Design a protein around this ligand. Structure first.
Ligand SMILES: N=C(N)c1ccc(CNC(=O)[C@@H]2CCCN2C(=O)CCC2CCCCC2)cc1
Ligand SMILES: [Ca+2]
Length: 223
């Protein structure tokens, strides 16, 4: 997260870290058994890390649980990142508590101009590289689809939306991949892609979760 702030420990209790010997993506807890992340975060051998603040220090509220299965959206296209969403099942249910909590799925989408919260452990510099070890937060509005498509012609689909600031300076970035965009208490986006990070007229692009709620609900009920 570029241009954001330190969230504070466990203030984003639905935020998970996916680990395969190291953090490599964010995700969101949607109930005690299931996490939502980006399809581009798919790999085998995932451990889900819940209750994290400093991801390099054991602070006392963590739960580390291996994934039993991963389910990439059946229409994910790795070339365009259309349908960039996947479901991860925990081999054992998480113990839910005030530091380890689920985020609600949308019943409807959110409108442009709605303020959201974006969070993660990704890069904090817009040029170069620095990784934080505590969770970072960013308040960011949903942008109009026309500003989104103008920035990225021919690349935006109806499964994507942009959020952030066209003047630059504040954005998500590498290593925030897969993590949440929460608006009005609902998971509306997943950190997916963008050109650089926090660059002028290059806002972030997020998977449009409200398009996937029926898929999510049917998939978890059958797996
Ligand atoms: N908001 C941002 N600025 C931002 C946030 C997170 C990320 C991380 N995502 C990535 O690195 C993703 C994974 C695969 C290629 N990729 C890219 O962004 C490269 C550009 C992609 C390539 C595929 C189709 C759309 C453009 C990239 C940018
Ligand atoms: Ca920790």
């Amino acid at each position: 997260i570029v241009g954001g702030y330190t969230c504070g420990a466990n203030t984003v209790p639905y935020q998970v870290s996916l680990n395969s010997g190291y953090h490599f993506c964010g995700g969101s807890l949607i109930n005690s058994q299931w996490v939502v992340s980006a399809a581009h975060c798919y790999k085998s051998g995932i451990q889900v890390r819940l209750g994290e603040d400093n991801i390099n220090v054991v602070e006392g509220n963590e739960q580390f649980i291996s994934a039993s299965k991963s389910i990439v959206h059946p229409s994910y296209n790795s070339n365009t990142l259309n349908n960039d969403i996947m479901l991860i099942k925990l081999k054992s249910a998480a113990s839910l508590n005030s530091r380890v909590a689920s985020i609600s799925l949308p019943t409807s989408c959110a409108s442009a101009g709605t303020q959201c919260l974006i969070s993660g452990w990704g890069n904090t510099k817009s040029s170069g590289t620095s990784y934080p070890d505590v969770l970072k937060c960013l308040k960011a509005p949903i942008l109009s689809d026309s500003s989104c498509k103008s920035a990225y012609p021919g690349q935006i689909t109806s499964n994507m939306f942009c959020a952030g600031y066209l003047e630059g300076g504040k954005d998500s970035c590498q290593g925030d991949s897969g993590g949440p965009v929460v608006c009005s208490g609902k998971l509306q986006g997943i950190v997916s892609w963008g050109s650089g990070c926090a660059q002028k007229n290059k806002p972030g692009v997020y998977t449009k979760v409200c398009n996937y709620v029926s898929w999510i609900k049917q998939t978890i009920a059958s797996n």
